Amino acid sequence: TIKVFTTVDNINLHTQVVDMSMTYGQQFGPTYLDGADVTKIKPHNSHEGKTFYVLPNDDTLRVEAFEYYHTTDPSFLGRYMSALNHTKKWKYPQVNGLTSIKWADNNSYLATALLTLQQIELKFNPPALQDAYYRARAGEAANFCALILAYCNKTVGELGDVRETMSYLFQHANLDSCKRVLNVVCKTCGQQQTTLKGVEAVMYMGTLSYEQFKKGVQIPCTCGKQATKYLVQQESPFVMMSAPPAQYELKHGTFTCASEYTGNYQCGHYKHITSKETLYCIDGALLTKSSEYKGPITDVFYKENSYTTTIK
Numbered sequence: 536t537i538k539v540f541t542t543v544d545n546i547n548l549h550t551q552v553v554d555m556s557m558t559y560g561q562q563f564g565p566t567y568l569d570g571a572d573v574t575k576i577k578p579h580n581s582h583e584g585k586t587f588y589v590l591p592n593d594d595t596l597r598v599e600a601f602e603y604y605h606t607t608d609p610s611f612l613g614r615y616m617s618a619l620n621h622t623k624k625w626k627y628p629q630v631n632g633l634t635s636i637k638w639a640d641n642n643s644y645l646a647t648a649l650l651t652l653q654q655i656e657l658k659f660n661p662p663a664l665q666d667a668y669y670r671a672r673a674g675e676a677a678n679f680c681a682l683i684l685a686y687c688n689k690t691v692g693e694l695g696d697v698r699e700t701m702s703y704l705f706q707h708a709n710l711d712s713c714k715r716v717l718n719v720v721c722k723t724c725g726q727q728q729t730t731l732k733g734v735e736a737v738m739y740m741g742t743l744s745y746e747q748f749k750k751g752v753q754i755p756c757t758c759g760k761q762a763t764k765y766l767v768q769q770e771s772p773f774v775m776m777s778a779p780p781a782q783y784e785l786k787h788g789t790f791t792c793a794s795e796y797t798g799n800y801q802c803g804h805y806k807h808i809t810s811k812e813t814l815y816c817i818d819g820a821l822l823t824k825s826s827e828y829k830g831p832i833t834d835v836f837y838k839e840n841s842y843t844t845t846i847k
């Protein structure tokens with residue numbers, strides 16, 4: 536017999552008396568010690584007093600996991616631990632002032648997402664995610680990346696999509712005050728306003744150019760004609776404009792940052808472009824400075840506070 540603590544969040548610890556003859560799995564279920572899976576292992580005397588992670592297998596643990604991670608998915612903790620085993624071994628160099636990720640396990644979409652998150656104003660709601668985010672900002676990004684994978688249902692090594700990653704993350708962010716008002720104008724059907732809130736207020740698919748969005752983009756109408764959709768009002772600290780990858784040029788001073796994608800879904804690679812005093816292409820640990828940039832851009836991020844159209 537030894538005494539240990541079990542936990543699902545490393546915040547609320549639960550005393551346990553362990554029997555030395557059974558494995559950890561037989562008496563607790565799947566169990567982790569400092570990230571290492573110990574389910575199959577017999578207890579050691581040197582384990583006394585240590586903290587073990589277990590799966591949320593009763594109502595106290597389920598509620599604690601829910602409050603810390605904001606999910607009820609039973610597989611969450613295990614997928615997070617599997618990911619964390621790998622992400623603790625990645626390297627997080629500081630590149631042009633931001634925490635990046637040295638390439639490994641097809642992780643360029645995560646590097647681009649992490650770099651983007653450090654340049655827009657955002658607050659995550661789950662305590663685990665926001666805590667890991669602040670550590671990632673300071674340079675210890677392993678937990679944040681493992682959590683990103685867990686929330687997106689991705690495993691280490693899988694190819695990822697930045698727009699989809701951002702959408703999952705934004706679902707967990709406090710964007711409830713973000714508002715977008717759009718107008719669609721058809722010569723036959725007339726005008727129709729729409730109001731969008733939260734994630735849908737800050738994300739748009741179809742054009743990369745915020746300016747074009749404000750002037751109007753051509754979209755189809757059911758009446759057979761082409762209508763014009765334009766941005767009437769925007770309240771948010773940033774917006775994200777996406778479109779299928781295509782040759783596009785980024786002008787210094789007109790955007791905050793952007794994602795470039797080369798390849799397809801079987802095989803590809805993201806790079807990150809940011810606008811500072813001049814343009815920088817952060818490519819994992821690699822850094823290239825240039826005054827112009829052209830490439831297959833797929834997402835562009837813009838600062839915003841409050842915008843109202845002057846179209847009549």
Ligand SMILES: COCCn1c2c([n+](Cc3cnccn3)c1C)C(=O)c1ccccc1C2=O
Pocket residue numbers: 601602603605606607660661
């Ligand atoms: C932070 O405010 C945002 C409002 N909110 C909260 C949640 N969810 C979504 C959700 C996601 N996965 C499963 C079920 N529900 C929203 C939209 C929680 O999960 C939650 C859990 C424990 C204490 C507080 C909260 C909480 O506040």
Ligand SMILES: COCCn1c2c([n+](Cc3cnccn3)c1C)C(=O)c1ccccc1C2=O
Pocket residue numbers: 696697778779780796798799800833
């Ligand atoms: C023009 O097709 C629009 C839909 N789409 C997209 C993709 N593909 C496959 C493909 C195959 N060969 C070359 C290029 N793309 C299609 C058909 C992406 O791989 C992709 C990767 C990263 C961000 C967005 C996208 C994206 O939107």
Ligand SMILES: Cn1c(=O)c2c(ncn2C)n(C)c1=O
Pocket residue numbers: 638797798802803804
């Ligand atoms: C620049 N680059 C890469 O660096 C890369 C890649 N696939 C894997 N890597 C690492 N592709 C398609 C690529 O264009």
Ligand SMILES: [Zn+2]
Pocket residue numbers: 721722723724725756757758759760762
């Ligand atoms: Zn019409």
